Amino acid sequence: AAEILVESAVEQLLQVDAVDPNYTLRKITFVDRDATNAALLAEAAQAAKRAWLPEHQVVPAPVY
Amino acid sequence: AIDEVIPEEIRPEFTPYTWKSPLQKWAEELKRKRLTSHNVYETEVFLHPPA
Amino acid sequence: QNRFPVLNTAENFRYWKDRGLDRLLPRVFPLKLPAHRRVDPLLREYIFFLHSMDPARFSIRKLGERYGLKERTVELICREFSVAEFLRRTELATPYTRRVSREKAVLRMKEALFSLKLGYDQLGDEDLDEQEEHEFRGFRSTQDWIQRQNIEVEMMSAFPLPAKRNPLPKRVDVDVTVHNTPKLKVMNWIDPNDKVVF
Amino acid sequence: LPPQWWDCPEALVEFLLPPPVENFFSVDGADLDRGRVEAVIRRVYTHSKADLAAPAEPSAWSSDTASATGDAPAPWLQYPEPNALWPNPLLHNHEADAAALEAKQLRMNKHRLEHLWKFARSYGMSWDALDEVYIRFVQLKRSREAQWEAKRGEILQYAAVVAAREVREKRKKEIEEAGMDLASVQPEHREQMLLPRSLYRKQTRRLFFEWRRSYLAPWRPGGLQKLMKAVVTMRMLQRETRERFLFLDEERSKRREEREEEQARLEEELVTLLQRQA
Amino acid sequence: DTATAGEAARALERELGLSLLQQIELPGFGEINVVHGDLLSG
Amino acid sequence: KMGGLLGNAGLVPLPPPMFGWRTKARYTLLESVMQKQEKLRENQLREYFKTAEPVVYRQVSEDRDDVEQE
Amino acid sequence: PRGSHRGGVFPVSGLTWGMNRPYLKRGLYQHRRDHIFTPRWGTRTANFNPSALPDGSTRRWENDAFKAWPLYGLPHHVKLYAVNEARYLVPAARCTAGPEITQYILNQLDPGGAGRNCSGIGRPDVRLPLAKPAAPSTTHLPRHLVQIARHVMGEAGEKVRRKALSFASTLSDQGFSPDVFDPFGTPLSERSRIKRLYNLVCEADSWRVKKAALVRDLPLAEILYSRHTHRLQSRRHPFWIDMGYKKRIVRIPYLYRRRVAKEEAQEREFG
RNA sequence: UUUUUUUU
RNA sequence: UUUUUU
RNA sequence: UUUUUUUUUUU
Q: Residues G240, G242, G243, G248: what is their CA dihedral angle, to the nearest 10 degrees?
C-alpha cells in the first residue's frame, strides 16, 4: 500500500495525465502518528526518488 | 450475522465495476459469452473441420 | 466419534487422492504450462513497448498490476520479446531456425496446441502476492526440521503450561562488494562469529 | 488486377487485395518526405503569431549534462519529428509593464520547459486512452479471420485452377530440355506426365497460402509498435506548444466545453496532412 | 554469548552516523514533498 | 607486491610505482591523448542514433553490412 | 571403472522371458517406450487423403487430449458448488449462541482478518440468501450519529426510504432496534467466492472414471506401468542412446522385407 | 506457413 | 525425388 | 541450456 501512495503523489505534481496543464497543487505532505509506520514510509520515498530523477539513477558496475 | 443459507448461483468474476480498466471489461465480456453457450461450448468434436 | 467440519483435518488432507487399490490405476493429468506463454502474443508486444518507452511511469510492478501479472513473470516477457525482435530487424536468422535445447522445443509445441484447442488468454489470471494457505507442496512441507519430530506430545492441563525453547538463527559467512574496477574486483569477507568488530 | 490473376471472381477480390487498414498512418522516416514533415510542424505553430525569438537550450551550446542531448536508441524516439521541435527558438506571443511581464513569463516558462523532459518522458495519452485504441485494433482484425474461415471452400476451390496453368507450362519446358520428343509416347501417359499428382498437390498448397497473410498490421517483427508510436506522439506535440505559451496567449475566455472541442478537430487536420500520397 | 552483538558494534554506529525523514524536491513542478510524521490534532 | 594490492583496496596508502612518480613525464602526455580520443569517439556515435540503420549497403557490389554495438 | 552390469539385468517394464512372450532374450530394453504408460494430448493424421482438393480433413483429436487441457469455465460446476456451500456453512447457521461463539466457528471455516482476502460470509455488510426475509444487522452502527442524522435527513429519508421496509418482516437479526437504523439507502449487495471449497470441486473432473481364479492376480508389470517412481533410472551414455534410434531407421525396414521375401516366394513356386 | 512432421 | 500438415 | 551482464537455483 505504501508504494501506491508515494508513486501517486509524484504524478499529480507533474500532471502527466493532462492535456492542458493547470498548476494549482504544489504541496503534498504525509503525516503518520505511528513511529513504525513512519519509518516504513520513508523507505518508499527512497524508491520513488529512484528511476525518476537523473541525479539518483543507479547502474550496475559490470554494465556501467 | 448468518442464518439458513439457500443455494444460489452467482458469478462474482463477471461483475462489471466503475474501477475496472477498459481492457478488463472487454476481456471478461468475451469469456462470459463462451461459458454461457449451450450449442458449441458443450459439445465434443473429433475432427477439426466440419466433415 | 468426533465433530470437526473443516478442510484441514487428517482425512481431508490431500483431497482427491488414491488411497487403496486405485493407486495403480492409470489416470490422465493436465499438462502444466508457464503463465508467460499462455498470454496473447499481441499483448506481449504492447507490454514490452511500454516498458521500453518510459520505465519511470511504467514501472515493473505498476505495469503488472493492470494486466494481473507477477513481478517475476512480467520480467521474462520483456526479455524473451527483445531477443526475438533483435534477430528479425538485423536480418540475422528466423525464430523458427533458431538453435535451442530440446526442453524448449517441446514447450513450444504445447503452447501452440494449447491455443488450438482452447485459445490464447486475453488477460492473465494470477495473484501478485502470495497468501498463507494450507496446501501440500512436496514431502518437506509437513515436517519439522528444527526439532526433527512428526508427532507433538504435550501435557493436558487447564492451567498455563510452560512455553517451549525457542530456536536461534544460524550464523553463516557471507561476502560483500566494496570497490569494483574494470581490472580488479575487491571484496570483503564478513565473519559474524567475531566478537570484535573494528 | 495483375494479368496472371485475371480470372478472379467478384466474390474473391477483397481477399487477395487487403484494404488499406482504416486510419493506419505512420510517423517513421522510412515513408516520409521533406515537404510533409515541414508542413506538419508549421500547422502547429500557426496557432499564434511571433516574429522575434531567442535560441534554444537543446542544441549543443557546450553540452555538459546527459539530459538535454541525444537519448539512447530506444524504439520510441527514432522517428524524425521532435529533433525538429526541441531546438526550435522560443517564440513570443505577439513598453514598461507591456514588456516586463512578457519577458518574465517567457523566462519562467523556459525553465519549466527544460525540466519537462528531464524527469518524465511520456506525457501524451492517458492509461485508459492508450488502451482504448488497443481494444478496437483487435476487434477490427478479428473480423477478417472470421471471414476467411467461412470462405474456406471458395478460396481453396479457386486456387485449384491457378496451379494448373503454371504446373502444365513449367513441366512442358522441363521435358523438352530433358526429353527428346512426346510424339511416340502413349496417349494415356501424356496427361499424367504434364500434370503429375506430386507437383499439382504441392503447388496448390503453396498457392493456397499465398492468398493468405492479409492484415499485415499485427506483425510480430515490428508491426504493433507502429500504431502506438503514431498515436501517442500526437498528444505530445500539442502539449509542447501549450507549455511555451501557458498564460501569455489566452485570457481564459472559454469554458471546458469549448476547450474540449478545440483540440478535437485539430487532430483531424494533422492526420490528413501527414497521411497523404500526392 | 553468540546471540547478540557486543558493545563494539553499538559504538561504531554512533560515529558512522547511523544512530523530518524524507523530502522529494523537484525544481519547477513541485515545491517539496515532506514525509514528516507527527500528530495532526496535537 | 603485497603493498600495491592493499593500496588499491584503501587499507594502506598507495605505494609509489617503479622509478618513482617524478620521472613519470611522458606517460602523463600519453594518457591525455588516450582520454581525448575517447571523448571524441563519443561525438561520432551521437549522430548514428538519429538515423540508425541495421542494414547498410555500399557502392561496391551492393554488399550487405550489419552494424551492432557492444 | 564400471563396465558391463554384473547381475540379473532385469527389464524396466518387469516382464518374464520365454517363448510366446514379448521379451525373448534377457536384457534391459530401456529404449522400449511402448510398454510405458504415456499420455496423448496431440493429434494424428491419416496415411492417405481421398479428397482431390488438398485439405487438412484427416486431423483428429485424441481421447486423452480433452482432459489434458481442461478449462474451469464449464457450467456444470457452479450448481454443485452452490449446494455444497449451504452444507458447509451449516455449523454456524444453526448455532443459537452469542457473537463470540459464532465468530470463532466462521473463522475456522474460512480464515479471514486484517490483510487477508476473505469471502465476506457472515459480516454485517453483506447480502446472504436467507430462507426467510430478515432485517439488516444495524447493531454495529453508532447511536450518536444516527440520532442526530434522523432529524436533518427529513421526512423523505425517514419513513419512505428505509423505514418503509425495515419492519415488514416478523423475523430480525441480532434482536431488534427500532431506534437505530440506516436512513441512507445504501444497498449492501454482492458477495465473494471462497478459495478452499471452490478449488476442490474444480479438480473433481480429473479423477472421474467411465477355469478362472477367484482372486485376480497382480502382475508386477501393472505397478510399473502407471507409476514411474519405482522404475530404474537410465545409465547409458546419451550418445549411444541417440545412435540406437538412428540405426533402426534403415535396419528395421530390412527385417520386415526379409521375412515376407521367403514366405511370398515359397507360395509363388510351390503353392 | 518457417527448407514443419523428418532422423551423419 | 514420395506422403501428411494453422 | 540468458543478445547488448562479468549478475541469474537457467531445466
A: 130
SS3 for C135-180 is: CCCCCCCCCECCCCECCCCCCCCCCCCCCCCCCCCCCCCEEEEEEE
Q: Can you tell me the distance from the alpha carbon of G246 to that of C79, in angstroms, rounded to the nearest whole number?
A: 37
Q: How far is the CA of C109 from the C1' of J8 (A)?
A: 26
Between CA D6 and CA D256 the distance in angstroms is 57
Q: What are the E-state strand segments in chain D?
A: 53-54, 90-91
d(CA G75, CA G134): 31
Cα separation, C160 vs C152, in Å, equals: 18
D237 membership: H or E segment, kind and range: helix D225-244
Q: What angle do CA D146, D147, D151 make, to 5 degrees?
A: 120
Nominal resolution in Å? 3.3
Breaks in chain G, after residue numbers (C to N greater than 2.5 Å):
210
Query: What's the CA dihedral at D117, D121, D126, D129 to 10 degrees?
Result: 120
Please tell me the experimental approach by which this structure was elucidated: cryo-EM
Helix (H) or strand (E) holding C40: none
**CB < 7 A to strand I: residues 26-45, chain G:** 45
Q: How many angstroms separate the CA atoms of D20 and D17, rounded?
A: 9
Q: Of C167, C194, C189, C165, nearest to C177 (Cα)?
A: C189
The residue whose grid cell reads 524473451 is: C80
Chain D interface, Cβ < 8 Å to B: 127-128, 131-132, 134-135
**G57 C-beta less than 7 Å away from strand I:** yes
Three cell numbers, residue G266? 515359397
Number of residues written out for chain D: 278
Burial grade of G11 (CB within 10 A; 0-12, 13-18, 19 or more): buried
Alpha-carbon distance of C134 to G196, in angstroms, equals 9
**Any idea which nucleotide's C1' is nearest the CA of G45?**
I4
Residue A61 has φ and ψ, to the nearest 5°, of -60, -45
Gaps in chain A (C–N > 2.5 Å) come after which residues?
Answer: none
**Other residues' Cβ atoms within 10 Å of the Cβ of residue D73:** 13
